[PDB]
Amino acid sequence: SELSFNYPNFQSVEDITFQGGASPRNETLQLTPTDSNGIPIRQRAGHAVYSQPFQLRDTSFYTTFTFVIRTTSNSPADGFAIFIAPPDFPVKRYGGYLGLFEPNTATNTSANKVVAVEFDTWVNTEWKEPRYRHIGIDVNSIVSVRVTRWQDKDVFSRSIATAHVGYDGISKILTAFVTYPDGGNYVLSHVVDLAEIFPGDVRIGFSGATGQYETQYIHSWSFSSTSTN
């Protein structure tokens, strides 16, 4: 279906729903919480999602957002993702699960219905993932179907980074381009029929998790979807 929205900042959150440990703070989406001294709280997850459902049948979409990861250590955890799931998808487990999965079914594709672009700051050995920090595309599993190295100079830049995420409903291809000012550029694509996975309604939004010594912020976000008929 057709939907568009545009948040240059989050002084308004009229149509944003916050769950779990996410909240609106300093004109941003703050995905995980901090205590009264600004210290990230451990083992928390949260979601900030656009509140209106949409459909993926015969649809392409384009979305772009800017983000900051604030780390206070050389060993931050766990990252964040932009995701799509049914409208009643809840905040799931903290830590390496990124608010999107739970331990007993995290790598079981038949037990999940969630697609995401993850920004993964903590190398987990509890399931298969690369031995360095990475950006990936997740289809129904915490084990990414396409994954690439995220350079530490970018992870730790404290820059306002940009993501572009698009879905071509004709070719059935999800793509992310991530850019850093005077930094790295990242390109990932994967063939996935989202309308097959999601024959009804979905919502799009962000999930963040700790971990430790890391807060994830969304500074701006826009979206448009169009019929491919």
Ligand X SMILES: CC(=O)N[C@H]1[C@@H](O[C@H]2[C@@H](O)[C@@H](CO)O[C@H](O)[C@@H]2O[C@@H]2O[C@@H](C)[C@@H](O)[C@@H](O)[C@@H]2O)O[C@H](CO)[C@H](O)[C@@H]1O
Which residues contact Ca ion by CB under 5 A? 96, 120, 122, 124, 129
Tell whether the torsion through CA atoms of 185, 190, 195 and 201 is positive or negative.
Answer: negative
Neighbours of 156 (CB within 10 A): 14
Q: Contacts with a second copy in 46-105 (CB under 8 A)?
A: 60-62
121, 213 Cβ separation under 8 angstroms: no
61 contacts 55 by C-beta, under 8 angstroms: no
User: How far, in whole angstroms, is CA 105 from its chain's centroid?
Assistant: 19
Q: Which two tokens stand for residue 191?
A: 């063939």
Q: How far is the CB of 47 from ligand X (least distance, A)?
A: 17
What does each C-alpha distance from 62 to 8, 36, 54, 115, 163 come to in angstroms?
16, 37, 14, 15, 11
Would you say 5 or 213 has its CB closer to ligand X? 213
Quick one: which of 9, 15, 13, 14 has its CA closest to 27?
A: 9
State how far the Cα of 36 lies from the Cα of 125, in Å rounded to an integer: 32
Q: Would you say 122 is a known binding-site residue?
A: yes
Mask for 162-201, x = binds ligand X (CB under 6 A): ----------------------------------------
Rounded CA-CA distance 1/198 in Å is: 13
Contact in structure between 46 and 20 (CB atoms under 8 Å): yes
Residues 196-225 that bind ligand X (CB under 6 A): 211-212
The reply to whether 113 sits near a second copy by the rule CB under 8 A is no
Q: Which stretch binds ligand X (CB under 6 A): 24-32, 90-98, 155-163, 183-191?
A: 90-98
Q: Is 77 in the site for ligand X (CB under 6 A)?
A: yes
Q: Is 214 annotated as a binding residue?
A: no
Q: CB nearer to ligand X: give 116 or 165.
A: 116
Q: What's the rounded Cα separation, in Å, for the pair 32 and 186?
A: 25
Cβ-based nearer residue to a second copy, 122 or 186: 186
- 118 assigned binding-site residue: yes
Question: Which of Ca ion, a second copy, ligand X, none binds 173 (CB below 5-8 Å, type-dependent)?
Answer: a second copy
122 interacts with ligand X by CB under 6 A:
yes
Annotated binding site for Ca(2+): 120, 122, 124, 129
Q: Per the annotation, where are the binding residues? A: 118, 120, 122, 124, 129, 134
- Which spans of this chain sit near ligand X (rule: CB under 6 A)? 77-78, 95-97, 122-126, 211-212
Binding site for a second copy (CB under 8 A): 60-62, 146, 148, 164, 166-168, 170-171, 173, 175, 177, 179, 184-191, 224, 226
